[PDB]
Structure 1
């Protein structure tokens, strides 16, 4: 599609369509793109005095990129409620992306007074990295996605990446990418850009909670035909003697029954309380944290493998670094109080996954004998074993959607730990840049590269449409289920609306696990 100056190159599409087992969400936003880095590539690195854990080396490019990797970019709160109250699972199917109504504007800063004017002949460059040749920076939970509220205008974030480093320096293996070394399409006002994408096959996300516990799967009315060791000594005349005795497990001793499965793996975290007085009076945010050690550096495990946030009757506690934490509206960046953030809770999976702040279990450490008593120890980290079952972390209305699976020789259960769908060929990155326009050149030749350009930026509309496949529930449960609902009581503001000043805000995080399912 291409036409003149006075022709819109696209329309505004924003709604959702529910049809059978599909739902199609399309959203449109308006964006603004500045000139980053003053048209330059720049090598960046960590500060000289930074600790060894915080060293890095990389580059920052003059390009921007579009990002729609959060659920609230596509679902309204009402649409999210429809989804989570009536379906056991869902997954993305295909995607459509469109960029249109481009406007480039030049700025003049004469005498502290700014004048903005159209530049009808300038252009912007766009290309999609459909072969995954650039370092993939999506899927790191960065800011700069499409806003949740359709009436908001957002700035396009700048592209940059990191490569191998040795302290603050680079090594011979580190690679540098010039994004101008890709074929890209140049658009003037009156051109548009589209492409399509098909998701690979992925398992449905489990939008349910189990109505049974992994350790409670037996018939409570019938005993087992297997025996377990129930007593190791028996009373003799005024004393005891070693004597093995066996029993069949029933309901009275349900903890001893033979079982076929084991709970999911574990990697223990430290426990903190939402009540301030319960926590220790010290700075253990890093010393008491759970981390992994890679190439001599320590890195915080956050949020880590999916484990239950707490056991029953203990909502006040949560793992130190084991849950997603969103910020309330207009909360700051650094060292905000607990009233400014929204802490998620993964308690629905405590039917199969162990609690994040307890041990996995206990194993024996010695060989008991006539003169040696049996000894056990706690297991604070347990890799996977044959016979384990577990659930993955839940997804949230304002959480990520997908993540690119790293191209490696091996990987196990490649669902991203922050939640979502792991894809070997995720939706490609979409890079965009204003073409530089040089200022008045000299009338005598000079071989030095240009350094004076016309100050300008661009704006336009972006739309993205995604088809999702649903998995309807088929429960024979008799009593009603738990549903997500709004409270009826009066209040100064309605949730998920704007306030008197025009600020849209999301008052709480919303998971997906409300319906139930048998184990």
Structure 2
């Protein structure tokens, strides 16, 4: 699209409509973009000394990108609630994007006095990496997505990436991608950039919780017909004499019943409690946390494989890195106290996946014989096994929406671990930069790189609309399901509202599983 200077390049679309089966969440926000790295690509690396587990090598670019991989960039409390309360599941189908009403300003810091003014002509160029030839950054839970609250103006993030490294230094194989080596489209004012995408058949996120659970799944009333090993030894006057007898598992017997499927896999996490007291006093934050390691650098295992966060009656506990944790609007960056964060809870799964903090089961160790007692041992890490079945990490309104499946020789069940939809070809990276403006050059020629540009930034609005599909409920469940509600009682502030000084804020994390489906 194209037009004039006194012509709005696009209108403001920010609705949300439900169609019974679909529902489209349109949404627009105003943004701003500075000139990063003063227009140059800069090489960047870990700090020489820095622990090995923390080295790196890569580049930062003068390019800034766009991102809305956060559910709340599309759903509004209320809306989300609608969804989350009457749908067995849902998934994204297609999207449409558009930047417009772009405007380029140029600040002038003459002595003790700045003065911003329109640089009409100068441009901002955009380009979408629709061929995925660029290090996909999104999906890395970074923060600089869209504001949950419309009215909020925002700054565009700067693109940076990482290649290979042998400590703080580069290794040859590492590649250096240059963003100008693409065909950016250049916008001036009166210019807009639209583009549209279509998702790929993915599974509806399961937005329901299970009423039955693996173990308790058969019918009480009837005993099976298969037998199991009831007792081993037997009374012989005073002493026992080994004599194995078997029984037919019934209701009273349950624990012993024969089955057909196994809980999901696991990778044991340390348990910490919301109650300061209980927790051993010391620094096992890193030392005790569950991790894995590549090329000799141990990394953390955050968002561990999807597994319930606490047994019955222990909402007080949680994994050291088995859950998602968001900050309460305002919460500072580092070492903030428990009271400043919102920890997610995944009890809803208990029913199928193991509890993060407790071992999977316990396999037998030795082979018993008359002169040898029967061994056994608990298992803290069980990789996928036939017959296992499980549930993936719920979603949360202010959580990630999707993530790119890495291009590898092999993947195994790609639901992104941080939760979300695992996409092979996700929404392409959208980039934006401000074509430089060489400030006054010298009369006599010089072949040096230009270094003195006009100080200036851009701004303008952006809009994103997405169509989601739904799987409606359908249970013959007689008694009421659970629903997500807002507290009745009076409060000094409404949840998901602007305070007295107009600061919007999300009180709690809102999950997705409320409706109840049987297993």
- TM-score scaled to structure 1, two decimals? 1.00
Give the C-alpha shift of residue 249 in structure 1: 0.5
In 2, the alpha carbon distance for the partners of 1:204 and 1:146 equals 23
In 2, the alpha carbon distance for the partners of 1:286 and 1:204 equals 36
In 2, the alpha carbon distance for the partners of 1:201 and 1:39 equals 40
Question: Deviation per CA, 1:408-436, whole angstroms, max 9, x where unpaired?
Answer: 00010011000000111000000000010
> Runs of 4 or more off by more than 6 Å in structure 1?
none
Alignment of 1:13-412 (within 5 A): 13-412=13-412
Give the C-alpha shift of residue 20 in structure 1: 1.8
Question: Deviation per CA, 1:275-299, whole angstroms, max 9, x where unpaired?
Answer: 0011011000000011001110000
Give the C-alpha shift of residue 112 in structure 1: 2.0
Give the C-alpha shift of residue 45 in structure 1: 0.1
Secondary structure of the equivalent of 2:28? strand
Give the C-alpha shift of residue 364 in structure 1: 0.6
Give the C-alpha shift of residue 48 in structure 1: 1.1
Question: Deviation per CA, 1:249-281, whole angstroms, max 9, x where unpaired?
Answer: 001111000000000000000000000011011
In 2, the alpha carbon distance for the partners of 1:2 and 1:228 equals 77
In 1, the alpha carbon distance for the partners of 2:172 and 2:239 equals 76
In 1, the alpha carbon distance for the partners of 2:513 and 2:15 equals 24
Give the C-alpha shift of residue 71 in structure 1: 0.1
Secondary structure of the equivalent of 1:181? coil
In 2, the alpha carbon distance for the partners of 1:55 and 1:181 equals 28
In 1, the alpha carbon distance for the partners of 2:469 and 2:205 equals 11
In 2, the alpha carbon distance for the partners of 1:328 and 1:452 equals 42
Give the C-alpha shift of residue 49 in structure 1: 1.3
In 1, the alpha carbon distance for the partners of 2:299 and 2:163 equals 17
Question: Deviation per CA, 1:199-236, whole angstroms, max 9, x where unpaired?
Answer: 00001000000000110111101111000001001101
In 1, the alpha carbon distance for the partners of 2:291 and 2:14 equals 43
Secondary structure of the equivalent of 1:362? strand
Secondary structure of the equivalent of 2:116? strand
Secondary structure of the equivalent of 1:112? coil
Question: Deviation per CA, 1:476-502, whole angstroms, max 9, x where unpaired?
Answer: 000001000001100100000000001
Question: Deviation per CA, 1:54-90, whole angstroms, max 9, x where unpaired?
Answer: 0000000000000000000000000000001000000
In 2, the alpha carbon distance for the partners of 1:99 and 1:10 equals 8
Give the C-alpha shift of residue 515 in structure 1: 0.3
Give the C-alpha shift of residue 358 in structure 1: 0.4
Question: Deviation per CA, 1:447-504, whole angstroms, max 9, x where unpaired?
Answer: 1111000000000000000000000011100000100000110010000000000100
In 1, the alpha carbon distance for the partners of 2:112 and 2:281 equals 52
In 2, the alpha carbon distance for the partners of 1:112 and 1:453 equals 20
Question: Deviation per CA, 1:33-67, whole angstroms, max 9, x where unpaired?
Answer: 00000000000000011000000000000000000
Give the C-alpha shift of residue 4 in structure 1: 1.2
In 1, the alpha carbon distance for the partners of 2:128 and 2:479 equals 50
Match of 2:441 in 1: 441
Give the C-alpha shift of residue 238 in structure 1: 1.5
Give the C-alpha shift of residue 239 in structure 1: 1.1
In 2, the alpha carbon distance for the partners of 1:130 and 1:256 equals 55
Secondary structure of the equivalent of 1:483? coil
Give the C-alpha shift of residue 303 in structure 1: 1.2
Secondary structure of the equivalent of 1:81? helix
Secondary structure of the equivalent of 1:276? coil
Question: Deviation per CA, 1:375-430, whole angstroms, max 9, x where unpaired?
Answer: 10000000001000000000000000000000000010011000000111000000
In 2, the alpha carbon distance for the partners of 1:516 and 1:438 equals 62
In 2, the alpha carbon distance for the partners of 1:215 and 1:2 equals 63
Give the C-alpha shift of residue 19 in structure 1: 0.6
Question: Deviation per CA, 1:112-153, whole angstroms, max 9, x where unpaired?
Answer: 211000001000110000000000000000010010000000
In 2, the alpha carbon distance for the partners of 1:81 and 1:259 equals 37
- TM-score scaled to structure 2, two decimals? 1.00
In 1, the alpha carbon distance for the partners of 2:252 and 2:2 equals 78
In 1, the alpha carbon distance for the partners of 2:316 and 2:8 equals 54
Give the C-alpha shift of residue 334 in structure 1: 0.5
Give the C-alpha shift of residue 240 in structure 1: 1.0
In 1, the alpha carbon distance for the partners of 2:353 and 2:3 equals 58
Give the C-alpha shift of residue 111 in structure 1: 1.1
Give unmatched runs, 5+ long, in structure 2: none
Secondary structure of the equivalent of 1:255? helix
Give the C-alpha shift of residue 92 in structure 1: 0.3
Give the C-alpha shift of residue 237 in structure 1: 1.9
In 2, the alpha carbon distance for the partners of 1:344 and 1:304 equals 13
Secondary structure of the equivalent of 2:367? coil
* CA root-mean-square deviation: 0.5
In 1, the alpha carbon distance for the partners of 2:346 and 2:318 equals 9
Give unmatched runs, 5+ long, in structure 1: none
In 2, the alpha carbon distance for the partners of 1:75 and 1:364 equals 50
In 2, the alpha carbon distance for the partners of 1:87 and 1:172 equals 51
In 1, the alpha carbon distance for the partners of 2:508 and 2:30 equals 26
Q: Which moved more, 1:101-110 or 1:1-10?
A: 1-10
